[PDB]
Amino acid sequence: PIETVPVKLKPGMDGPKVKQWPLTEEKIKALVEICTEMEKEGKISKIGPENPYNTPVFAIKKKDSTKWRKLVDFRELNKRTQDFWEVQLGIPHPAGLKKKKSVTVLDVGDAYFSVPLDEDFRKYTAFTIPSINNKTPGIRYQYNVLPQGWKGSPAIFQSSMTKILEPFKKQNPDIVIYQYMDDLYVGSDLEIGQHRTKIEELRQHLLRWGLTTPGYELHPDKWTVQPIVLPEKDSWTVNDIQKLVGKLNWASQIYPGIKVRQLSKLLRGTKALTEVIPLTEEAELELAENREILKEPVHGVYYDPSKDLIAEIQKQGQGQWTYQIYQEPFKNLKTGKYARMRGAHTNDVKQLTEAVQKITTESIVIWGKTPKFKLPIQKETWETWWTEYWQATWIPEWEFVNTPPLVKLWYQ
Amino acid sequence: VPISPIETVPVKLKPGMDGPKLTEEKIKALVEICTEMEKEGKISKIGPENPYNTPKWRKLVDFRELNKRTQDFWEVQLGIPHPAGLKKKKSVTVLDVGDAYFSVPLDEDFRKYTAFTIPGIRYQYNVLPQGWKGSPAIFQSSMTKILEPFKKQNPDIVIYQYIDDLYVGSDLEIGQHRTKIEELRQHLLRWGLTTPDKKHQKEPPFLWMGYELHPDKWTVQPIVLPEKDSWTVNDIQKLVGKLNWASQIYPGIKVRQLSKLLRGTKALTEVIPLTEEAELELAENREILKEPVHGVYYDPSKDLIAEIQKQGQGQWTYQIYQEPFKNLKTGKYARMRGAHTNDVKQLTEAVQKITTESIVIWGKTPKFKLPIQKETWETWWTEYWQATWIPEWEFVNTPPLVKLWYQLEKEPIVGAETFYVDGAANRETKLGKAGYVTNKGRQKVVPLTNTTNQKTELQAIYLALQDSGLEVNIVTNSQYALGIIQAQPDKSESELVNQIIEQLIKKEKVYLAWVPAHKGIGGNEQVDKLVSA
DNA sequence: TACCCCCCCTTCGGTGCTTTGCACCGAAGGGGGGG
Ligand SMILES: Cc1cc(/C=C/C#N)cc(C)c1Nc1ccnc(Nc2ccc(C#N)cc2)n1
CA distances from residue A199 to A92, A184, A195, A208, A216 in whole angstroms, order as listed: 22, 11, 6, 14, 10
Q: What is the distance between the alpha carbons of residues A173 and A372, in angstroms, rounded to a whole number?
A: 34
DSSP state at residue A408: -
Measured CA to CA, the distance from residue A213 to residue A203 in angstroms comes to: 8
Cβ contacts (< 8 Å) between A378 and chain B: which residues?
352, 386-388
Binding-site residue positions of A for Mg(2+): 107, 182-183
Q: How far apart are CA A255 and CA A299, in angstroms?
A: 8
Residue A67 · residue A29 · CB < 8 Å: no
Cα–Cα distance, A376 to A385 (Å, whole number): 14
Where b means 16+ CB within 10 Å and e means fewer, A78-115 reads bebbeebbeeebeeeeeeebeebebbbbbbbbebbbeb
The H-or-E segment that residue A58 falls in is: strand A57-60
H or E segment to which residue B276 belongs: helix B276-289
The greatest distance separating any two alpha carbons of chain B, rounded to the nearest whole angstrom, comes to 107
φ, ψ at A44 (rounded to 5°): -125, 155
Question: Closest Cα partner for A362 from A73, A62, A97?
Answer: A97
3-state helix, strand, coil in chain B (%, to 5): 30, 20, 50
**CB of B87 shorter than 6 A to ligand 1:** yes
Q: How far apart are CA B501 and CA B22, in angstroms?
A: 71
Whole-Å CA distances, A208 to A167, A175, B117, B173, B186: 12, 21, 67, 62, 55
Is the bond preceding residue B400 a cis peptide, omega within 30 degrees?
yes
Sequence-distant (≥ 6) Cβ neighbours of residue A274 within 8 angstroms: A237, A238, A239, B412, B413, B414, B415, B416
- Asked if B461 and B474 touch (Cβ cutoff 8 Å), the reply is yes
**Ligand 1 atom 15, closest CA:** B158
Which residues sit directly before a break in chain B (C to N > 2.5 Å)?
Answer: 21, 55, 119
Compute the distance from residue B174 Cα to the ligand 1 centre, in Å: 16
Name the DSSP letter for residue A55.
B
A54, A242, A348 member nearest B513 (Cβ):
A242
Q: How many CB atoms lie within 10 A of CB B387?
A: 21
Which of A21, A238, A273, A275 to mutate against chain B (most B CBs within 10 Å)?
Answer: A273
What is the distance between the alpha carbons of residues A201 and A195, in angstroms, rounded to a whole number? 10
Find out whether A370 and A364 touch, Cβ atoms under 8 Å.
yes
Other CB atoms within 10 Å distance of the CB of residue B105:
22
Give the resolution to one decimal, in Å: 3.5
Task: Using most ligand atoms within 8 A of CB, pick from B80, B89, B200 the residue to mutate for ligand 1.
Answer: B89
Neighbours of B166 (CB within 10 A): 22
Q: How far is the CA of A191 from the centre of ligand 1 (A)?
A: 65
Say if residues A126 and A51 touch (Cβ distance below 8 Å): yes
Quickly list DSSP for A171-212: H-TTSEEEEETTEEEEEE-S-HHHHHHHHHHHHHHHHHHT--
Angle between helices B343-361 and B374-381 (to 10 degrees): 100
Range B288-291 contact pairs with CB under 8 angstroms and sequence separation of 24 or more:
B288/B250, B288/B251, B288/B252, B288/B253, B289/B223, B289/B225, B289/B246, B289/B250
Q: Which of B359, B383, B387 sits opposite A352 (nearest CB)?
A: B387
Whether the CB of B206 sits within 6 Å of ligand 1: yes
Residue B76: exposed, middle, or buried by beta-carbon count in 10 A (0-12, 13-18, 19+)? middle
CA distance B201 to A126: 40
Q: Which nucleotide is nearest to B340 (CA to C1')?
A: C23
- The radius of gyration computed from the CA coordinates of chain A, to the nearest angstrom, equals 26
Residues 6+ apart with CB under 8 A from B91: B169, B170, B171, B172, B173, B174, B177, B215
Identify whether the C-beta of residue A316 lies closer than 8 Å to the C-beta of residue A377: no
Cα B383 to middle of ligand 1, angstroms: 48
Chain A nearest-CA distance from B246, in A, is 20
Does residue B211 line the site of ligand 1, with CB under 6 A? no
The answer to whether B280 and B312 are in contact (CB under 8 A) is no
Q: Which nucleotide is closest to the Cα of B246 by its C1'?
A: C32
Is the separation of the CB atoms in B221 and B212 below 8 Å? Answer: yes
User: How many angstroms separate the CA atoms of A45 and B358, rounded?
Assistant: 32
Could you list the beta-strand ranges (E) of B478-524.
509-514
Identify which of B81, B359, B389 has the shortest CB distance to residue A24. Answer: B359
Distance B204 CA to ligand 1 centre (A): 11
What whole-number distance in Å separates Cα of residue B128 and Cα of residue B111?
9
- Three-class DSSP category at B503: helix
CA distance B304 to B327: 10
Atom of ligand 1 nearest to the CA of B205: 25
Residue A102 phi, psi dihedral angles, 5° rounding: -140, 130
Write out B121-190 in H/E/C secondary structure: CCCEECECCCCCCCHHHHHHHHHHHHHHHHHHHCCCCEEECCCCEEEEEECCCHHHHHHHHHHHHHHHHC
Binding residue positions of A: 107, 182-183
- The span from the CA of A371 to the CA of A334, in Å, is 11
Distance of alpha carbon A136 from alpha carbon A116, whole angstroms: 31
Please give the torsion angle defined by the CA atoms of residues B143, B144, B147 and B152, in that order, rounded to the nearest 10 degrees.
Answer: 180
Determine the atom of ligand 1 nearest the C-alpha atom of B297.
19
Q: How crowded is the C-beta side of B186, counted as CA atoms within 13 Å?
A: 5
Beta bridge partners of A311: A325, A373
Tell me if A251 sits within 8 A of A258, measured CB to CB: yes
B contacts of A133 (beta carbons < 8 Å): 81-82, 85-86, 360-363
**CA–CA dist B197, B100 (Å, integer):** 13
Nearest atom in ligand 1 to B206's CA: 8
* Ligand 1 pocket, residue B158 CB under 6 Å: yes
* CA A172 to chain centroid: 29
Q: Whose CA is nearest to atom 9 of ligand 1?
A: B167
A134·B437 Cβ contact <8 A:
no
Contacts with A101 (C-beta within 8 Å, 6 or more apart), sequence order: A187, A188, A189, A190, A219, A220, A221
Distance CA B245, CA A250 (A): 52
Report chain C positions within 7 A of protein CB atoms.
5-11, 16-26, 30-35
Amino acid letter at A133?
N
Angle, CA B246 vertex, CA B241 and CA B251 arms, to 5°: 125
B364 with A25: Cβ contact below 8 A: yes
Are the C-beta atoms of residues B270 and B327 closer than 8 Å to each other? no
User: What is the identity of the amino acid at B55?
Assistant: P
What φ, ψ does residue A404 adopt, rounded to 5°?
Answer: -85, 115
Cα separation, A22 vs A36, whole angstroms: 20
Cis peptide before B447 (omega within 30 of 0): no
**What span, in angstroms and rounded, lies between the C-alpha atoms of B519 and A260?**
9
Residues B15 and A406: their CA atoms lie apart, in Å, by 56
